[PDB]
Every structure is written in structure tokens, then in C-alpha cells.
Paper text:
Activity-regulated cytoskeleton-associated protein (Arc) is a multidomain protein of retroviral origin with a vital role in the regulation of synaptic plasticity and memory formation in mammals. Arc has an N-terminal domain (NTD) involved in membrane binding and a C-terminal domain (CTD) that binds postsynaptic protein ligands. In addition, the NTD and CTD both function in Arc oligomerisation, including assembly of retrovirus-like capsids involved in intercellular signalling. In order to develop new tools for Arc structural and functional studies, we produced and characterised six high-affinity anti-Arc nanobodies (Nbs).
To further characterise the Nbs in their free state, Nb E5 was crystallised, allowing for structure determination at 1.42-Å resolution. The structure shows the typical immunoglobulin fold, an incomplete β-barrel of nine anti-parallel β-strands. The overall structure is compact, and the three CDR loops extend from the protein. Despite its elongated nature, the CDR3 loop is rigid in relation to the rest of the protein. Hydrophobic residues of the CDR3 pack onto the exterior of the central β-barrel to shield non-polar side chains, which might account for the high solubility of this Nb. Furthermore, the two tryptophans and the basic residues in the CDR3 loop suggest a negatively charged, buried epitope. The central disulphide (Cys24-Cys97) appeared mostly reduced, possibly due to radiation damage. Upon further inspection, it became clear that it was partially oxidised, and was refined to 20 and 80% occupancies for the oxidised and reduced rotamers of Cys97, respectively.
Numbering used by the authors: 3 to 120
């Protein structure tokens, strides 16, 4: 029982663009920082971008200038606009609430798959 669902992944060539979306229960989303994470095979999910309920955003250096995170508070939905995609962006992407402390032990949705062809 998770309260999140991601969509919008696809296969694209390098230089392409995608827009991911995640709809979440208001009880997870409302008033709370939300983030996009990505996972490649064998590895932990790594946070990519985060957005506060007051629209403050954070990004890992390697996606700055390329990705944009946003939220629609009336639909409890978070978005990740992914431009200038690179093979190093190939991963399963997940959204979740961004809690204090380490992220271990949360329940996750199914993710959405993004492949950027070599």
C-alpha cells in the first residue's frame, strides 16, 4: 500500500526531452517537500531534484540547466521536465516525500522508466 504513482517515462535519443509526473495522496503531498529520485540497476535510489510546498527547489549539479521540477498543489502532482537528456540519465525514476534523515525505509511506487539511447 503506497500512496504515489509515477508516469511519463519513455525511450528517447540523446538530446531529447521527457516530462514525468507523479500524483500523490494529499496526506503525503500537501505542505511537504517532494522529490524525484532515480535508480540504475544494483544501486540505491539517488535524489535528483526536490521542491518545497513554497516552491523552493534543489537540484543535483549534474541536472542543473537540464531538468526542472515543479508542483501543482491543486492536483497533488509533482512534475520533472527533463531536457537535453543524456545516457547517464537512463534509470527508473521515482517520486516521494523528502523526509529528514536518511531516506531508507520508505514505501515507493512502481517508478517510471527512462532510457536515453547510446
Amino acid at each position: 500500500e503506497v500512496q504515489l504513482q509515477e508516469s511519463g517515462g519513455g525511450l528517447v535519443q540523446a538530446g531529447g526531452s521527457l516530462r514525468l509526473s507523479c500524483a500523490a495522496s494529499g496526506s503525503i503531498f500537501s505542505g511537504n517537500a517532494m522529490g524525484w529520485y532515480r535508480q540504475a540497476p544494483g544501486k540505491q535510489r539517488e535524489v535528483v531534484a526536490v521542491i518545497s510546498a513554497g516552491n523552493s527547489s534543489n537540484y543535483v549539479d549534474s541536472v542543473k540547466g537540464r531538468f526542472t521540477i515543479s508542483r501543482d498543489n491543486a492536483k497533488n502532482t509533482v512534475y520533472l521536465q527533463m531536457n537535453s537528456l543524456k545516457p547517464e540519465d537512463t534509470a527508473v525514476y521515482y517520486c516521494n516525500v523528502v523526509k529528514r534523515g536518511p531516506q531508507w525505509g520508505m514505501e515507493w511506487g512502481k517508478g517510471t522508466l527512462v532510457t536515453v539511447s547510446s
